[PDB]
Design an enzyme around this catalytic site. Sequence first.
Site, PDB file in Angstrom:
ATOM      1  N   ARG A  38     -13.901  -3.842   3.302  1.00 14.97           N
ATOM      2  CA  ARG A  38     -14.098  -2.897   4.400  1.00 14.97           C
ATOM      3  C   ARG A  38     -15.206  -3.388   5.324  1.00 14.97           C
ATOM      4  O   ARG A  38     -15.038  -3.386   6.548  1.00 14.97           O
ATOM      5  CB  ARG A  38     -14.401  -1.492   3.873  1.00 14.97           C
ATOM      6  CG  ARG A  38     -14.427  -0.443   4.977  1.00 14.97           C
ATOM      7  CD  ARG A  38     -14.703   0.940   4.442  1.00 14.97           C
ATOM      8  NE  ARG A  38     -14.665   1.898   5.538  1.00 14.97           N
ATOM      9  CZ  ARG A  38     -15.611   2.794   5.780  1.00 14.97           C
ATOM     10  NH1 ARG A  38     -16.647   2.907   4.954  1.00 14.97           N
ATOM     11  NH2 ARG A  38     -15.475   3.617   6.814  1.00 14.97           N
ATOM     12  N   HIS A  42     -14.805  -4.275   9.406  1.00 18.92           N
ATOM     13  CA  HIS A  42     -15.694  -3.707  10.419  1.00 18.92           C
ATOM     14  C   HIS A  42     -16.525  -4.749  11.161  1.00 18.92           C
ATOM     15  O   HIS A  42     -16.746  -4.619  12.370  1.00 18.92           O
ATOM     16  CB  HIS A  42     -16.589  -2.633   9.813  1.00 18.92           C
ATOM     17  CG  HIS A  42     -15.894  -1.322   9.613  1.00 18.92           C
ATOM     18  ND1 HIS A  42     -16.170  -0.211  10.382  1.00 18.92           N
ATOM     19  CD2 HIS A  42     -14.934  -0.942   8.734  1.00 18.92           C
ATOM     20  CE1 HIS A  42     -15.407   0.795   9.992  1.00 18.92           C
ATOM     21  NE2 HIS A  42     -14.646   0.378   8.996  1.00 18.92           N
ATOM     22  N   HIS A 163      -5.942  -1.246   2.055  1.00 22.81           N
ATOM     23  CA  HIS A 163      -6.148   0.003   1.328  1.00 22.81           C
ATOM     24  C   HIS A 163      -5.551   0.008  -0.080  1.00 22.81           C
ATOM     25  O   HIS A 163      -5.750   0.950  -0.851  1.00 22.81           O
ATOM     26  CB  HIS A 163      -5.618   1.199   2.165  1.00 22.81           C
ATOM     27  CG  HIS A 163      -6.455   1.477   3.368  1.00 22.81           C
ATOM     28  ND1 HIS A 163      -6.034   2.266   4.413  1.00 22.81           N
ATOM     29  CD2 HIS A 163      -7.689   1.032   3.698  1.00 22.81           C
ATOM     30  CE1 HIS A 163      -6.984   2.309   5.331  1.00 22.81           C
ATOM     31  NE2 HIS A 163      -7.998   1.561   4.924  1.00 22.81           N
ATOM     32  N   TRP A 179      -5.984   5.053  -2.839  1.00 21.95           N
ATOM     33  CA  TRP A 179      -4.604   4.987  -2.386  1.00 21.95           C
ATOM     34  C   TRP A 179      -3.695   4.638  -3.548  1.00 21.95           C
ATOM     35  O   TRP A 179      -2.504   4.970  -3.540  1.00 21.95           O
ATOM     36  CB  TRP A 179      -4.431   3.933  -1.277  1.00 21.95           C
ATOM     37  CG  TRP A 179      -4.991   4.326   0.053  1.00 21.95           C
ATOM     38  CD1 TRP A 179      -4.290   4.831   1.118  1.00 21.95           C
ATOM     39  CD2 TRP A 179      -6.352   4.226   0.479  1.00 21.95           C
ATOM     40  NE1 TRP A 179      -5.143   5.067   2.177  1.00 21.95           N
ATOM     41  CE2 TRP A 179      -6.413   4.704   1.810  1.00 21.95           C
ATOM     42  CE3 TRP A 179      -7.532   3.768  -0.127  1.00 21.95           C
ATOM     43  CZ2 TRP A 179      -7.613   4.735   2.549  1.00 21.95           C
ATOM     44  CZ3 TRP A 179      -8.720   3.793   0.607  1.00 21.95           C
ATOM     45  CH2 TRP A 179      -8.752   4.290   1.927  1.00 21.95           C
ATOM     46  N   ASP A 208      -2.119   5.826   7.748  1.00 24.90           N
ATOM     47  CA  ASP A 208      -1.163   5.171   6.829  1.00 24.90           C
ATOM     48  C   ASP A 208       0.263   5.701   7.061  1.00 24.90           C
ATOM     49  O   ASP A 208       1.214   4.942   7.187  1.00 24.90           O
ATOM     50  CB  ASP A 208      -1.533   5.406   5.350  1.00 24.90           C
ATOM     51  CG  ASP A 208      -2.933   4.956   5.011  1.00 24.90           C
ATOM     52  OD1 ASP A 208      -3.314   3.829   5.421  1.00 24.90           O
ATOM     53  OD2 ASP A 208      -3.648   5.736   4.337  1.00 24.90           O
TER      54      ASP A 208
HETATM   55  C1  HEM Z   1      -5.678   1.031  10.394  1.00 25.81           C
HETATM   56  C2  HEM Z   1      -6.871   1.490  10.781  1.00 25.81           C
HETATM   57  C3  HEM Z   1      -7.753   1.964   9.619  1.00 25.81           C
HETATM   58  C4  HEM Z   1      -8.206   3.209   9.390  1.00 25.81           C
HETATM   59  C5  HEM Z   1      -7.966   4.479  10.233  1.00 25.81           C
HETATM   60  C6  HEM Z   1      -8.991   3.172   8.168  1.00 25.81           C
HETATM   61  C7  HEM Z   1      -9.641   4.239   7.606  1.00 25.81           C
HETATM   62  C8  HEM Z   1     -10.338   4.219   6.425  1.00 25.81           C
HETATM   63  C9  HEM Z   1     -11.027   5.342   5.837  1.00 25.81           C
HETATM   64  C10 HEM Z   1     -11.100   6.757   6.470  1.00 25.81           C
HETATM   65  C11 HEM Z   1     -11.562   4.915   4.683  1.00 25.81           C
HETATM   66  C12 HEM Z   1     -12.417   5.705   3.665  1.00 25.81           C
HETATM   67  C13 HEM Z   1     -13.903   5.466   3.922  1.00 25.81           C
HETATM   68  C14 HEM Z   1     -14.672   6.264   2.884  1.00 25.81           C
HETATM   69  O1  HEM Z   1     -14.578   7.532   2.900  1.00 25.81           O
HETATM   70  O2  HEM Z   1     -15.332   5.647   1.990  1.00 25.81           O
HETATM   71  C15 HEM Z   1     -11.225   3.528   4.515  1.00 25.81           C
HETATM   72  C16 HEM Z   1     -11.594   2.754   3.434  1.00 25.81           C
HETATM   73  C17 HEM Z   1     -11.243   1.442   3.209  1.00 25.81           C
HETATM   74  N1  HEM Z   1     -10.704   0.594   4.132  1.00 25.81           N
HETATM   75 FE1  HEM Z   1      -9.735   1.214   5.918  1.00 25.81          FE
HETATM   76  N2  HEM Z   1      -8.974   1.885   7.693  1.00 25.81           N
HETATM   77  C18 HEM Z   1      -8.220   1.098   8.549  1.00 25.81           C
HETATM   78  C19 HEM Z   1      -7.954  -0.260   8.421  1.00 25.81           C
HETATM   79  C20 HEM Z   1      -8.353  -1.086   7.389  1.00 25.81           C
HETATM   80  C21 HEM Z   1      -8.170  -2.523   7.285  1.00 25.81           C
HETATM   81  C22 HEM Z   1      -7.425  -3.388   8.337  1.00 25.81           C
HETATM   82  C23 HEM Z   1      -8.748  -2.923   6.134  1.00 25.81           C
HETATM   83  C24 HEM Z   1      -8.822  -4.362   5.545  1.00 25.81           C
HETATM   84  C25 HEM Z   1      -7.747  -5.177   5.561  1.00 25.81           C
HETATM   85  C26 HEM Z   1      -9.308  -1.746   5.494  1.00 25.81           C
HETATM   86  C27 HEM Z   1      -9.968  -1.733   4.288  1.00 25.81           C
HETATM   87  C28 HEM Z   1     -10.483  -0.671   3.607  1.00 25.81           C
HETATM   88  C29 HEM Z   1     -10.905  -0.690   2.228  1.00 25.81           C
HETATM   89  C30 HEM Z   1     -10.836  -1.874   1.236  1.00 25.81           C
HETATM   90  C31 HEM Z   1     -11.408   0.721   1.968  1.00 25.81           C
HETATM   91  C32 HEM Z   1     -11.982   1.296   0.659  1.00 25.81           C
HETATM   92  C33 HEM Z   1     -13.497   1.353   0.814  1.00 25.81           C
HETATM   93  C34 HEM Z   1     -14.175   1.740  -0.476  1.00 25.81           C
HETATM   94  O3  HEM Z   1     -13.523   1.785  -1.539  1.00 25.81           O
HETATM   95  O4  HEM Z   1     -15.394   1.963  -0.430  1.00 25.81           O
HETATM   96  N3  HEM Z   1      -9.046  -0.650   6.286  1.00 25.81           N
HETATM   97  N4  HEM Z   1     -10.469   3.133   5.590  1.00 25.81           N
HETATM   98  C1  LIG Z   2     -11.433   1.086   7.033  1.00 26.32           C
HETATM   99  N1  LIG Z   2     -12.508   1.113   7.457  1.00 26.32           N
END
Ligand code: HEM
Ligand SMILES: [C-]#N
Length: 250
Positions: A38, A42, A163, A179, A208
């Site tokens: 993540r 970012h 995710h 997820w 998603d």
């Molecule tokens: C499509 C647009 C995206 C949206 C709207 C989105 C949104 C989110 C949200 C709301 C979370 C939860 C944050 C939290 O409450 O800890 C999250 C977590 C996460 N995101 Fe995304 N995301 C997007 C794209 C991506 C992409 C492109 C990647 C990497 C390829 C990614 C990787 C991750 C990972 C690995 C987590 C888990 C974080 C954790 O376990 O602490 N996301 N995302």
């Molecule tokens: C996904 N940040």
Amino acid sequence: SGKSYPTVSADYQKAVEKAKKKLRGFIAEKRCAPLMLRLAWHSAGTFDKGTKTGGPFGTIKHPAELAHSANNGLDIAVRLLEPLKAEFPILSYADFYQLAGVVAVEVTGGPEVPFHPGREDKPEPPPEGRLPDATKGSDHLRDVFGKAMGLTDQDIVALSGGHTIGAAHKERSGFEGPWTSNPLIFDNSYFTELLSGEKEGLLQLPSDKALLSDPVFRPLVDKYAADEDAFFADYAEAHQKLSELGFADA
Ligand code: HEM
Ligand SMILES: [C-]#N
Ligand SMILES: [K+]
């Protein structure tokens, strides 16, 4: 894809190889691979194709960026990496965070994403508001990945597969839970769960679910749920592209 890789010293390259190993051990032990991926997304993603300013250039470390409501938890990720980063002072933060993302994918069993060093740390972050909204749909995905970053519709769906590892947190975004049933295993389960409906204890963001109703995104969701190898191939392609927006005179 329009990328020219800068030359770095033999010493820089050695630190890269050594840092990658230390990152594997650290990330596996701390169980923080999702957060690191993540952080990488970012640190790459505050990139713009309409301005070409800010993004994948050590900018996420700044407390002006760690403030954002899409950045809850990014402060934690940066902090976890501080002591390791101090062991490799020659490496740019930009490269370090991208190396951490590559490693996060690797040590959770995902594809080997090629890594090239040479991103420079830039002195000023991009503006707040460019980054993703979980409550939005396909137009939004195309805005953040396509218009801002130059990624394709195939990249969008593959990368959303990130995710497949990790979870949301009520105190960070407000959403809650993993997820997938195996949130430290990089596999195509994100896509299987998305197709199977909403399960007890499993998260789907509106962003998603946008993949399922779009005429272009849906056949890709079907393909990756059916073929993990196809997922791994397209994911590695898109992760590399994303990681390299910080290179090569853009
Ligand atoms: C499509 C647009 C995206 C949206 C709207 C989105 C949104 C989110 C949200 C709301 C979370 C939860 C944050 C939290 O409450 O800890 C999250 C977590 C996460 N995101 Fe995304 N995301 C997007 C794209 C991506 C992409 C492109 C990647 C990497 C390829 C990614 C990787 C991750 C990972 C690995 C987590 C888990 C974080 C954790 O376990 O602490 N996301 N995302
Ligand atoms: C996904 N940040
Ligand atoms: K998984």
